[PDB]
């Protein structure tokens, strides 16, 4: 449709719109929750919010939601396939995102603190998801190194130990990292680092199905680093660290959705 491709609004306006559409609850990843428990406060909240939206042209004077907005919102709330995005930006603040797909339509939702954006997007365009998947990171170029691997569990134990403030050299000994690899491997644990956790999910046949292990993208002073899972035969998960390029990200996420019963979106 000729026009703006997005709706931008506060979490409260979003919630009021979902409530009025009967769209259902937002996905947990977006973390949009009802402001009040009480019924009168709620009804007032809704009238107010709706007024402001009417003023914003999102809803017409009669009270009917713009059909594109309604479709984007419904696609997010009722989504049959999706990606969940948690961007941990430094300490204390995070960007929350979703790529939702219902009936051939694909909607991106991003939310930060007070604001949420819903925008339609065409996945037909090559690498079209890569700027979304990196939206909340530092803009770092892909690092230069040969691939390495760690047992996923060990990696997690290491991160836990480093947040508890234990010496790096002993943790890198614990992982079995040779002194030669240490400056690189450290960066994955580096104190100033931005990362995003990506998970794929779908629902079919009475089941919500998501990937038990996800994919990570990590901006470090040494560069952009992609981590992706492979299940070993002994039952242990392996994390593989590779440069964070767009090909690498695209492929990794595609494989991620492919591990689900309904497969890729291609």
**DSSP character string of the chain:** --S--EEEEEHHHHHHHHHHHT--PPPGGG----S-S-HHHHHHHHHHHHHHHHHHTSB-TTSPBPHHHHHHHHHHHS-SEEEEEEEEETTTEEEEEEEEEETTEEEEEEEETTEEEEEE--TTSTTTTHHHHTTTS--PPBP----EEEEHHHHHHHHHHHHTT--HHHHHHHHT--TTTHHHHHHHT-SS-EEEEEEEEEEETTEEEE-SS-EEEEEETTEEEEEEEEE-TTS-EEEEEEE--HHHHHHHHHHHHHTSTT----
Distance CA 219, CA 176 (A): 23
HEC secondary structure over 106-172: EEEEEEECCEEEEEECCCCCCCCCHHHHCCCCCCCCECCCCCEEEEHHHHHHHHHHHHCCCCHHHHH
Is the CA virtual torsion 76, 214, 123, 129 positive or negative? positive
**137 phi, psi to nearest 5 deg:** -105, -175
Distance CA 219, CA 68 (A): 35
Question: Tokens 């947040």 — which residue?
Answer: 163
Distance CA 237, CA 226 (A): 16
Closest CA to 198 of 78, 76, 97, 80: 97
Distance CA 224, CA 251 (A): 16
Method: X-ray
Closest CA to 45 of 10, 74, 77, 71: 10
Question: Tokens 């703006």 — which residue?
Answer: 4
Q: Are 185 and 175 in contact (CB under 8 A)?
A: yes
Distance CA 136, CA 152 (A): 24
Is the CA virtual torsion 50, 52, 56, 62 positive or negative? positive
Residue 146 corresponds to which tokens in the numbers above? Answer: 């040969």
Distance CA 119, CA 101 (A): 12
Q: Are 76 and 109 in contact (CB under 8 A)?
A: yes
Residue 7 corresponds to which tokens in the numbers above? Answer: 């709706």
Number of Cβ atoms within 10 Å of the Cβ of 49 = 22
Residue 118 corresponds to which tokens in the numbers above? Answer: 């819903």
**55 phi, psi to nearest 5 deg:** -65, -35
Distance CA 36, CA 16 (A): 12
Distance CA 179, CA 185 (A): 10
Residue 165 corresponds to which tokens in the numbers above? Answer: 């403030």
What are the sequence ranges of the domains in the chain?
1-266
Q: Which residues pair with 107 in a beta bridge?
A: 100, 120
CA distances from 50 to 9, 12, 15, 18, 103 (A): 12, 10, 11, 11, 28
Residue 89 corresponds to which tokens in the numbers above? Answer: 């930006």
CA distances from 45 to 40, 51, 117, 179, 232 (A): 8, 10, 21, 59, 52
**30 phi, psi to nearest 5 deg:** -75, -20
CA distances from 112 to 29, 85, 116, 140 (A): 12, 12, 6, 21
């Amino acid at each position: 449709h000729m026009g703006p491709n997005a709706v931008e609004l506060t979490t409260d306006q979003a919630w009021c719109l979902a409530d009025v559409l009967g769209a259902g609850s937002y996905p947990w990843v977006l973390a949009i929750t009802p402001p009040y428990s009480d019924h009168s406060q709620r009804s007032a909240f809704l009238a107010a919010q709706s007024a402001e939206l009417t003023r914003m042209g999102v809803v017409n004077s009669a009270g009917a939601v713009d059909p594109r907005v309604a479709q984007w919102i419904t696609t997010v709330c009722r989504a049959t396939q999706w990606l969940d995005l948690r961007f941990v930006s430094g300490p204390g603040d995070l960007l929350r995102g979703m790529v939702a797909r219902r009936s051939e339509e694909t909607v991106v939702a991003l939310r930060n603190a007070q604001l949420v954006t819903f925008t339609a997007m065409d996945i037909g365009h090559q690498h079209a998801l890569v700027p979304v998947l990196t939206a909340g990171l530092s803009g770092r170029k892909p690092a230069r190194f040969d691939d390495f691997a760690l047992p996923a569990a060990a990696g997690a134990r290491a991160d836990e130990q480093i947040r508890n403030g234990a010496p790096l050299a002993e943790v890198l000994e614990f992982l079995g990292v040779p002194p030669s690899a240490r400056p690189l491997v450290e960066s994955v644990f580096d104190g100033r680092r931005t990362y995003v956790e990506i998970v794929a999910g779908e629902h079919r046949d009475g089941h919500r199905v998501t990937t038990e292990v996800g994919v990570s993208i990590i901006d470090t002073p040494h560069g952009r680093i992609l981590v992706h899972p492979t299940k070993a035969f002994d039952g242990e998960w392996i994390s593989t660290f590779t440069p964070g390029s767009a090909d690498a990200i695209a492929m990794a996420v595609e494989r991620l959705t492919a591990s689900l019963p309904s497969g890729s979106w291609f």
